[PDB]
Design a protein around this ligand. Structure first.
Ligand SMILES: Nc1nc2c(ncn2[C@@H]2O[C@H](COP(=O)(O)OP(=O)(O)O)[C@@H](O)[C@H]2O)c(=O)[nH]1
Length: 171
């Protein structure tokens, strides 16, 4: 059972930077003799083997055919905005609604992430984002890919949200 994590949000909010920081501290080699290299790289987060995908919808991915496929396949979603980019925060609701529509479910594991919290130019207050997360019923954390503040915790929290969802669906 790999946990399938998807990182979603506006262009330039730091999705790649966050994911690279996570992989750097959580990748391992795994022995697998049924593979014609005998070892593969895996990411292990809070004891779980995880797959990682980044969903962009702007830039080159404005020409993509894959947006809904990423939402169907992902099991939990890091919904990233940047604390110095009001429009990226306003975009979050559209991403969340789209995920709910594609997955046809109201309880989708998700964590709201306010990235670039090292920056002094802030236009999205912590309380604004906390209120949004509370309405959705999901955790909120502020992160910095530059300082590593919050990065591990954001992904660990998402893994726990997926775990609790899998435990519920099993029951
Ligand atoms: N100061 C600061 N810059 C960041 C942070 N995360 C990403 N960046 C910068 O923001 C820009 C976009 O980051 P990127 O990972 O390419 O965002 P993506 O388009 O969402 O994948 C790059 O210049 C990054 O170096 C952060 O936490 N703090």
């Amino acid at each position: 059972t790999e946990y399938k994590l998807v990182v979603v949000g506006a262009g330039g909010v730091g999705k790649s930077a966050l994911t690279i920081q996570l992989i750097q501290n959580h990748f391992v080699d795994e022995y697998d003799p049924t593979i014609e290299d005998s070892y593969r790289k895996q990411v292990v987060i809070d004891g779980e083997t995880c797959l990682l995908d980044i969903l962009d919808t702007e830039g080159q991915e404005e020409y993509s055919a894959m947006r809904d496929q990423y939402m169907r396949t992902g099991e939990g979603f890091l919904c990233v905005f940047a604390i110095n980019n009001t429009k990226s925060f306003e975009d979050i609701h559209h991403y969340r609604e789209q995920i709910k529509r594609v997955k046809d479910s109201e309880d989708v594991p998700m964590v709201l992430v306010g990235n670039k919290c090292d920056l002094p130019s802030r236009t999205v207050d912590t309380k604004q984002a906390q209120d949004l997360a509370r309405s959705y019923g999901i955790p909120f954390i502020e992160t910095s890919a530059k300082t590593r503040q919050g990065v591990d915790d954001a992904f660990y929290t998402l893994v726990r949200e997926i775990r609790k969802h899998k435990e519920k669906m099993s029951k």
